[PDB]
Design a protein around this ligand. Structure first.
Ligand SMILES: *[C@@H]1O[C@H](CO)[C@@H](O[C@@H]2O[C@H](CO)[C@@H](O[C@@H]3O[C@H](CO)[C@@H](O)[C@H](O)[C@@H]3O)[C@H](O)[C@H]2NC(C)=O)[C@H](O)[C@H]1NC(C)=O
Ligand SMILES: *[C@@H]1O[C@H](CO)[C@@H](O[C@@H]2O[C@H](CO)[C@@H](O)[C@H](O)[C@H]2NC(C)=O)[C@H](O)[C@H]1NC(C)=O
Lengths: 162, 57, 54
């Protein structure tokens, strides 16, 4: 695997340093090492609408992955994002899709009563992939690339080197 | 004529029922050919060895 | 109406505008939605605007 940064930049009113208790590191709150949880700078303020693009220039396709947030109650989405409707539009020269956060009650898993679900796609060389998000997006900050061929073993026996 | 083989199903996760059955059907139907083919193939080598060695005498 | 001895293949498509300025022109300002129905096949779609490479 090889990793290439995306270079995304966000405005003054977007806080890309969201953290949660259920993903710990060094005894402090943390998040996934390659995904950025955008939220409003100040609770209650409508999330500004923004558009982002990834500009591929390498010679081989890269595997881009992202996720979306599904709050737990109306009291949450009104705080993290705002009161207007949320919607996310994705688009490349080959991949199109549309999503929307939806809120509902759920059983508690770990210390969080919400959910985040991940998608992925392949970005061909010389192409552009666009993220037009108004709220609820969990944007990436690095995109991996897969190189070579190998073998995958699925077992639990001790390793031997001789 | 060695050819490397990969894994087509997960040993710790689960597989969909619709496709899991098709994978299961093919494997059991392919194991039934090697088992039948090996039994008879060896029996035709034991048979010839006995006849061959008795002609040399 | 399929008044014939054999089943026919029917195909269609849906538009996905490129900007808010486009849908307001081609169709209008209300909300768009498409409902399909037969005795065996039921589905629903909706145009959604976004941004894409050319
Ligand atoms: C496809 O084939 C596999 C392998 O033949 C099937 O998996 C086997 O499923 C049976 C139940 O249908 C399992 O038996 C039960 O397992 C546990 C053992 O603790 C327990 O509930 C019972 O005592 C019973 O033995 C069996 O273990 C399982 N085999 C393996 C290796 O996991 C599979 O169901 C077949 N079909 C599909 C759709 O996957
Ligand atoms: C992807 O984005 C790039 C810019 O990052 C686009 O490149 C532009 O293409 C137009 C149309 O041919 C040219 O007039 C511009 O000069 C190009 N810009 C640069 C900076 O080189 C590109 O068209 C987009 N689409 C694809 C499919 O690559």
């Amino acid at each position: 695997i090889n990793k290439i940064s995306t270079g995304f930049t966000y405005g003054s009113s977007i806080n890309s340093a969201g953290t949660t208790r259920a993903c710990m590191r060094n005894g402090g709150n943390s998040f996934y090492a390659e995904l950025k949880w955008l939220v409003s700078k100040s609770k209650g303020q409508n999330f500004p609408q923004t558009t982002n693009t990834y500009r591929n220039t390498d010679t081989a396709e890269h595997l881009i992955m992202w996720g979306i947030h599904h709050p737990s109650s109306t009291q949450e989405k009104n705080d993290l994002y705002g009161t207007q409707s949320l919607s996310i539009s994705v688009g490349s020269s080959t991949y199109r899709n549309n999503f929307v956060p939806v809120v509902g009650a759920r059983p508690q898993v770990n210390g969080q009563s919400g959910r985040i679900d991940f998608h992925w796609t392949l970005v061909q060389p010389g192409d552009n992939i666009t993220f037009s998000h108004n709220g609820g997006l969990i944007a990436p900050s690095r995109v991996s690339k897969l190189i070579g061929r190998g073998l995958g073993i699925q077992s639990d026996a001790p390793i031997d080197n001789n | 004529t060695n050819t490397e083989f990969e894994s087509i199903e997960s040993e710790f996760s689960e597989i969909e029922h619709q496709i899991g059955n098709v994978i299961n059907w093919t494997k059991d139907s392919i194991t039934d050919i090697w088992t039948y083919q090996a039994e008879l193939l060896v029996a035709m080598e034991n048979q010839h060895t006995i006849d061959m060695a008795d002609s040399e005498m």
